[PDB]
Design a protein around this ligand. Structure first.
Ligand SMILES: CC(C)CCC[C@@H](C)[C@H]1CC[C@H]2[C@@H]3CC=C4C[C@@H](OC(=O)CCC(=O)O)CC[C@]4(C)[C@H]3CC[C@]12C
Ligand SMILES: CC(C)CCC[C@@H](C)[C@H]1CC[C@H]2[C@@H]3CC=C4C[C@@H](OC(=O)CCC(=O)O)CC[C@]4(C)[C@H]3CC[C@]12C
Ligand SMILES: CC(C)CCC[C@@H](C)[C@H]1CC[C@H]2[C@@H]3CC=C4C[C@@H](OC(=O)CCC(=O)O)CC[C@]4(C)[C@H]3CC[C@]12C
Ligand SMILES: N[C@@H](CCC(=O)O)C(=O)O
Ligand SMILES: N[C@@H](CCC(=O)O)C(=O)O
Ligand SMILES: N[C@@H](CCC(=O)O)C(=O)O
Lengths: 425, 425, 425
């Protein structure tokens, strides 16, 4: 047990903290009248953890976007890389939109302005007038009686969408610079590494903060049965989203573009799928999916050796669907109804959050803060999903490993002629 | 025609967009009652263009000022470079002040707080207490009844003057660092190049945005005759400013400092002046003005080879006068009366905007946003000047080519002894 | 006298400006009814100096913290360096807390919200949700009647504590990067050098600004006797703090950790103490304290050669006590009572300000702006302490030279065995 617990010390501490917070909240529930100041003090370390995590989303957005869009090696990759990237973005967006549809349909949490103006505000926030203002303020439409007056007022909160847009453009241009801008790419690589070190430093404090957050959420909520039902229905929504996506949409895509049976493709990647369901890490399953594709499905080594390592981090269908579903679920437990602009923001920032989330287990929860602050939702509600994360995490990594495999198959099919010409010469 | 239109594709697209927007606005004028939401939708791509242009004025201010003030090579230039720089700044400021005088006199557009407090607020904004706040907020004096209470309140809007002051000081100090700070000069060179690439990317979208802006302005305004008269009088103001400046002030300066006939100097640069009136580009006329000065006017090759290439971009009298005139004209069509501090801000930011504006045709309109956001004016009114830009642009480049020529003559006269000593040894 | 005045030109100008401002304020006192606009104009150059100094506290905080925490050479120093650093921070914090205690006791200046919420707000500001917002805004608790509602509202003012925390973490992580991040360390070294050049540029303007500030403060205040008494009692508070600290706390520490007579240690450093009382510069006395320790007290050359040069700038007990005392004194003349969070902020930023303040004479006043803007106090009141700085400065540098000497003795005692082992091998 000493090697068992000491192997993944962070995981042991996080599980112990979650259990300790849950049991302490349950025990404190016995004192039915509770002082708001006392519950504030109990949840305060959770606030500290949330504040140190939200403190770093701006340097992470900047450095991550710049570093990723510069270190693409597009010319070296070729058209194979472009096909892989298009497939990655397409499937991630499909997964995010499917998740949004499923939450807005099932609405777990609801049991408990003009749309045109909302979309125009979305487009306005996508192009902020000022970067320093966009770091903490979003513009919005307000109509107040004086036929009716409408103007633009700055509401507080990070303008995540606008910053992401500007720094995607910035990274693209700086990559287009080429061998120049090497100094600035190195500067932002160093900045990103420093911020990741800070994020790990925070993650070591995470057990105590999560324990306090869960204790506060348990002691605060009125009816435990209502929240249990909401959590169960949220998990059902995520599971249905993953099943539909990774068992219908991806097979349908692979059949449309390749005219081949996707169920004959499934058997080839069954071992990779099981390993993902066990390892709960897309990166760990990577050698397994190489061997499975290369020997069972006969995919060429060039296309798999490119697609799989990149898709193990960039291409995460399940995490995207999970993040969209859970962001709308956090919105729905609070009673906050989301405008069209906020729904589109959830979709886009769920595509971005999936890309950022590394293949380490339980990173979607960390990247969730991107969506939560983009929409402006109470970030404290993450602990509820922390409670049941792991079971969804296994399914998520299974789905996105299946997505990687189908992408490898599709890109190989669309590049059979090119590889034939290369081998002939 | 295919080579005609395909040669300057951006110019073809911009002219086509301006004509299309004007004709579409004229056609939509037939539906006299028009919905504010519909006109908002029509002008929305114009808002997107304006927002992407205003989004980049802060990185342009920072990177441009730093790069320019570092890459001066003052020691290599000598006293000849200092004389050239002094002449450039002096004539640019004279042109800007003359333009301000002429607009405040003729007031095209008007047909349609204590001054001491205004100037003190100007000096306060020149030295901001905080850079991050100066990026989006200016301080101002407010007097409200309670002998009378006066305090300082932060009004929204970029503090362009304060940022320019701080980063001029920053660039000067970093240049004084010398061979050190090479890394930071390289960093800011890369940043400036990236932002210029983004500006070009935006400029390719410019035709659609300008078309929508002109359509919105045509459909919104009440009487077309009033706006036509205002535009005509604004063009008359710019033309009178250019005539007075480049036919009186510059010849008077050259006669005062050299005791020589400036009209004998004019004939030497007549070919350069005509080429500028045709090419509409100060950089393009540059070989012509070299040959004209060097052979007709006998100016030494050292002084001309230094003055002309630098003055082709730094020294723009006509663009400075144009930008001051047009900023006050935009203020005057809106009914906004300008305090003394705002007038001085217009003058200073018109000197800076002329320096920044590259010798490519129709760049003063892009640099105009510096002045418009420094004073806090509706940037959408740029399209009105876009309509009649080119005719003023030809005169502007003619005037500033004349300014370059007179600067070369003056600097040669003030450096006859130094060049004589150099040649003797 | 020409060499006398021309030797320290800045000091001559500052003393002349202080005397000129005092005499001009005294003369203007004869016109008892004075216009608020006229006194505003008189003190305006003081406002310009204060604004240019406050303008640079953010780049100084960032660059100084990053540069210092990277250029530590912890591995090369060894455990001797760690012991020296621990002693430095411990004694600086003790001095700051002693100063806070002494001002809150004697309260020079007073003659003229829940504490839990205050401390929670302190901890919240220590971890800001946004860096760009933390650059100019602090969060605070507000309770307004509707049992009672409490929420968080953003009050204006720099969040110095949060920025210091984040950039201490940033510098620590970037130092941990090692030979990587050399580019970013070089970038921030260049930035720090540039900002120091700007600070010197401002300091050359300091005489006029200080003269105008003292003139405004003399003409504004009602009773000169009251302010004279307050200044005298403030000086008495600083002197008592220095006496208690450097004659009880440091000797007591050295006796506790070494079991040796600290008064036998005092005689060894008497010459260094006198030189500090004369030179008014900790760096200048440095060779004197080397010779005194090395020959009178027999401290080993390794430990002294490490401790003394580092402690001449990092370790300033007297400046820390002075800065805490004077920040609370500035708060007390204005009638502003300080919450617990503001007192802790004064203590922490007084520890930081002492570290930053270079060993040049009269730098504590410049670093005082860190504390004054951290707490949000009128920075114009610095001139009152400027009037009587020098006499306190001599005592301050005497006390912190004594602190350096006691640190060298203590670190040598705690490292006798290590040096014995090194010499034996
Ligand atoms: C699930 C239902 C809603 C179907 C939706 C799926 C399609 C809309 C998307 C998903 C994957 C996309 C494919 C992913 C890969 C590519 C290669 C890519 O081809 C390129 O243009 C590469 C550049 C080049 O050819 O040089 C874009 C088309 C295509 C077939 C995409 C076509 C559109 C697809 C099939
Ligand atoms: C149009 C009416 C209002 C006359 C206004 C023009 C003058 C006020 C300005 C315009 C050009 C300026 C001249 C431009 C060039 C120089 C060289 C320069 O000399 C230097 O000090 C260079 C440094 C050195 O000598 O080492 C400054 C003076 C002078 C004659 C300037 C003197 C003032 C001038 C004539
Ligand atoms: C004035 C009154 C309130 C007494 C307060 C003084 C003590 C609380 C502080 C001041 C100096 C500190 C000492 C400064 C130096 C060190 C070495 C340092 O030892 C280390 O751990 C170095 C790391 C290592 O051993 O490798 C920390 C303990 C100690 C004795 C500190 C113990 C606590 C001290 C005595
Ligand atoms: N489960 C993901 C990691 C991120 C997440 O849990 O959302 C994977 O390894 O594929
Ligand atoms: N016409 C200017 C370019 C900038 C502007 O049009 O204002 C020139 O080439 O001299
Ligand atoms: N007197 C200090 C310098 C900083 C200050 O005066 O506070 C010293 O030289 O030790």
């Amino acid at each position: 047990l000493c090697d068992k617990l000491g192997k993944n010390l962070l995981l042991t501490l996080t599980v112990f903290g979650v259990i300790l917070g849950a049991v302490c909240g349950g025990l404190l529930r016995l004192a039915s009248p509770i002082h708001p100041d006392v519950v504030m003090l109990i949840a305060f370390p959770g606030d500290i953890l949330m504040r140190m995590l939200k403190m770093l989303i701006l340097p992470l957005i900047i450095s991550s976007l710049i570093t990723g869009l510069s270190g693409l090696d597009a010319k070296a990759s070729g058209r194979l890389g472009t096909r892989a990237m298009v497939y990655y973005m397409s499937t991630t967006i499909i997964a995010a939109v499917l998740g949004v549809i499923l939450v807005l349909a099932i609405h777990p949490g609801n049991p408990k302005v003009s749309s045109l103006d909302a979309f125009l505000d979305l487009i306005r926030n996508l192009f902020p007038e000022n970067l320093v203002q966009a770091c903490f303020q979003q513009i919005q439409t307000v109509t107040k009686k004086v036929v009716i007056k409408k103007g633009l007022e700055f509401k507080d909160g990070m303008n995540v969408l606008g910053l992401i847009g500007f720094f995607i453009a910035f990274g693209i241009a700086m990559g287009k610079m080429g061998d120049q801008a090497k100094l600035m790419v190195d500067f932002f690589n160093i900045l990103n590494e420093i911020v990741m070190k800070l994020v790990i430093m925070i993650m070591w404090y995470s057990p105590l903060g999560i324990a306090c957050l869960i204790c506060g959420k348990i002691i605060a909520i009125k009816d435990l049965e209502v929240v249990a039902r909401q959590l169960g229905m949220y998990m059902v929504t995520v599971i249905i989203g993953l099943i539909i996506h990774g068992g219908i949409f991806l097979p349908l895509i692979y059949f449309v573009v390749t005219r081949k049976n996707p169920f004959s493709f499934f058997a080839g990647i069954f071992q990779a799928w099981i390993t993902a369901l066990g390892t709960a890490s897309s990166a760990g399953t990577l050698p397994v999916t190489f061997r499975c594709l290369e020997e069972n499905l006969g995919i060429d080594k060039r296309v798999t050796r490119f697609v799989l390592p990149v898709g193990a981090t960039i291409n995460m269908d399940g995490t995207a669907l999970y993040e969209a579903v859970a962001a709308i679920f956090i919105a729905q437990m609070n009673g906050v109804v989301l405008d069209g602009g906020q729904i589109v923001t959830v979709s886009l920032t769920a595509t971005l959050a999936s890309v950022g989330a590394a293949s380490i287990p339980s990173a979607g929860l960390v990247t969730m803060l991107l969506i939560l602050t983009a929409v402006g939702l109470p970030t404290e509600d993450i602990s509820l999903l922390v409670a049941v994360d792991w079971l969804l995490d296994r399914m998520r990594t299974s789905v996105n490993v299946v997505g990687d495999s189908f992408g490898a198959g599709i890109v190989y099919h669309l590049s059979k002629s090119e590889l034939d010409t290369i081998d002939s010469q």
